[PDB]
Design a protein around this ligand. Sequence first.
Ligand SMILES: [Cl-]
Lengths: 47, 206
Amino acid sequence: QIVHVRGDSETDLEALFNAVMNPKTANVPQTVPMCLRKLPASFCKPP
Amino acid sequence: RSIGTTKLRLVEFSAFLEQQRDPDSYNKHLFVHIGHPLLESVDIRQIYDKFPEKKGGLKELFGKGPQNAFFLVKFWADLNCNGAFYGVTSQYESSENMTVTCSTKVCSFGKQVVEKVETEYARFENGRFVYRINRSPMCEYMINFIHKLKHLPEKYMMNSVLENFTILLVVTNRDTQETLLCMACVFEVSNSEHGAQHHIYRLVKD
Ligand SMILES: [Cl-]
């Protein structure tokens, strides 16, 4: 196996969580929530 | 309802944690698994922002085709779990003898943060060519990610975090650089009693 880990992976991983734990402080991109997107109804309803 | 084409099929995929408490005790927990009547489709424009769109990104790969090789898998991950090894095992089959390149990209906020690259050779089994990636170790990012996710008080917070986390799996014919399979992966945390679940969608142009 060959593995390419980006420069700030530790920072980046932390950013993943305080994006939700500290939303007004985190300087991270925002997105339309998946369950609000034009996707099949099954997408957020487990079988 | 399968992830595959006439040239390559994903037969089995599973991500797991193995624990060996003592020499007589073994435990294995599956986070997600595939493989153990018509597929719904998904407009791929609805997910382009979820994956890297530089050179070699999903949009470029999809434009090159073949578009029937492209899938979106929605996972409900089983994080209900208590010497430890985190790993991924997968199996592919083909009618053709190939050397295969398997690229697994972990993406956060639609940007690649980790890429694992594995090369696999065919074995002829049961009348066709088979590709096995056995106990591939999870990168440190994934292991630390699962840990942090688990430390969160409630499941809905985990889901909120997973909004920004995706995995892109691309399998390539090494000789021709042809795309054999591409799997775009999105995650929520399971709340069921049967554990991990998933949905498979065909990706289509509009
Ligand atoms: Cl399964």
